Amino acid sequence: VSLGFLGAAGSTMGAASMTLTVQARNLLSTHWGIKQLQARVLAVEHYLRDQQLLGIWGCSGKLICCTNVPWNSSWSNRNLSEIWDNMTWLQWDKEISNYTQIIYGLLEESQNQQEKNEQDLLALD
């Protein structure tokens, strides 16, 4: 059966991939309503920032999105099976937290170039 929201936390990275949906569908879900209003607004802003970034990278509607940027051993040098079968996502995030911005920048560059190349091919036939 389902483990619930964050139920997979602590499970291995390759196991937790089966719970991406449950953790995605749970996003966006006298007087003194101002606190409630401020909370509702913030939840929306965070949601949209993640969606905007995925859109920039070309990952419009997918929970799993592959990108043409190669992985650098300088960011993390581990076996493919260590990463997916032994480590969890909390650990992984700590191991590569110092490369977050460079990876994101590279992803944006790749998609931008790809859009230009697609436009040129459409023009040529």
């Binding site: 964050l6 401020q38 799993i64 992803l107």
Partner: protein
């Protein structure tokens, strides 16, 4: 040669400080719970296997948020109530001597004063009783104690001060991590955790010295402190069994009221039917002695096997701080706890704690927002459970081998820390990357 893969919906989080909201659980109460959002009676709790989370109850901002929400709810309740400014007059007062017993001597006064009526051009003579604690002699001339600080607002007679559980719920995008370890002492990693959306209805109980109507430890007394060897820090002790305490104000109170302006009804004690006796609380001796023995054993684990432990009274600097303050029946009690903390531990029959009653209340350590507590008609009896203690350590650098503990208390955030100790708020960070063998 692997390419970077982007995943969304990843089960990770980071510590965060956000805004929480209340869930009432479904007419008038000081906590204004009608402004809260009703929730399901049985929120689902998700157990997290193989997850260890670092906790620190002393740096938990959820505590600060309750403190602020509680103060604000309190003020919203008083904001629309009777102003009672016209009562700050010179009073003519004598002692109530007609039928009191020895202990109650000089603690209750009979005052007369010239107060306004509905019509601006008319006045009335009013007689009322006041407790000694609220009336200060100037230069038979007295004034109310609040006159040289601020105006006093009368609490609304229809609004209850009884606590209603307030569950605190995280906003979307956030989650609350709960520590379940038996014997969790407030800090460090907690190997058994779970996720909840709302906390377990913490009650806004207001007290000093002793903690009332809280949760119990599952098996042993738990001692929690920021730094136990630092004598500047408080120690919070959670009990694994309740101690029943029976408090009363054993006098038949006849309540009277007048109008002091258009509307603006003022309430006061008219008189007392029968003889006068002091307020008090009853704690069984056997229960209390067993309870301390459990506490002493746990203290020795930090202060040394064969270390001598002595319990003593607090300093006399502040009436609220040095006594056990509570709001039984809508009246405010100030009980002397010395009978509970007078013992040296070296390896039907009850304790009676005398209590005073005060009507002018100045709470939350603020200055100038005094409240007048209306008297309560008839006779008041409350049964409460002591579910924890506040202690401070007092000693020097000398290795006397004996440590002394005193009740301490007085900082309201400690009551909140005691119950919120197991919760942490984190931000969900669903977006992230990892390498694999997939390329577009």
């Amino acid at each position: 040669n692997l390419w970077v893969t982007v995943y969304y919906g990843v089960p990770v989080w980071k510590d965060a400080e956000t805004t929480l909201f209340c869930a009432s659980d479904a007419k008038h109460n000081v906590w204004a719970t009608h402004a809260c959002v009703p929730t399901d009676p049985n929120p689902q709790e998700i157990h997290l296997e193989n997850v260890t989370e670092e906790f620190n109850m002393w740096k938990n901002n959820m505590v600060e948020q309750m403190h602020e929400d509680i103060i604000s709810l309190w003020d919203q309740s008083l904001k629309p109530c009777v102003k009672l400014t016209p009562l700050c007059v010179t009073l003519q007062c004598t002692n109530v001597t007609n039928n009191i017993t020895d202990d109650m001597r000089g603690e209750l006064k009979n005052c007369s004063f010239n107060m306004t009526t509905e019509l601006r051009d008319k006045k009335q003579k009013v007689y009322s009783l006041f407790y000694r604690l609220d009336v200060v002699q100037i230069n038979k001339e007295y004034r109310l104690i609040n006159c040289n600080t601020s105006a006093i607002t009368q609490a609304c007679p229809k609004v209850s001060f009884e606590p209603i559980p307030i569950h605190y719920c995280a906003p979307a995008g956030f989650a609350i991590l709960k520590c379940k370890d038996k014997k969790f002492n407030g800090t460090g990693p907690c190997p058994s955790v779970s996720t909840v959306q709302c906390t377990h209805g913490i009650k806004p109980v207001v007290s000093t010295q002793l903690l009332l109507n809280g949760s119990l430890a599952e098996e042993e007394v738990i001692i929690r402190s920021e730094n136990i060897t630092n004598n500047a820090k408080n120690i919070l002790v959670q009990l694994n069994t309740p101690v029943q305490i029976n408090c009363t104000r054993p006098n038949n109170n006849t309540v009277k009221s007048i109008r002091i302006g258009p509307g603006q009804a003022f309430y006061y004690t008219g008189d007392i039917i029968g003889d006068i006796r002091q307020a008090h609380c009853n704690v069984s001796k056997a229960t209390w002695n067993e309870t301390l023995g459990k506490v002493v054993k746990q203290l020795r684990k930090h202060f040394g096997n064969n270390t001598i432990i002595r319990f003593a009274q607090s300093s006399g600097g502040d009436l609220e701080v040095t006594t056990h303050s509570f709001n039984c029946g809508g009246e405010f009690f100030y009980c002397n706890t010395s009978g509970l903390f007078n013992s040296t531990w070296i390896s039907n029959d009850s304790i009676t704690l005398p209590c005073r009653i005060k009507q002018i209340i100045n709470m939350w350590q603020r200055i100038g927002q005094a409240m007048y507590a209306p008297p309560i008609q008839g006779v008041i009896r409350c049964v409460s459970n002591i579910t924890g203690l506040i202690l401070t350590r007092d000693g020097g650098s000398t290795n006397s081998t004996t440590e002394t503990f005193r009740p301490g208390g007085g900082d309201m955030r400690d009551n909140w820390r005691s119950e919120l100790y197991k919760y942490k708020v984190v931000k969900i960070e669903p977006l992230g990357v990892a390498p694999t063998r997939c390329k577009r």
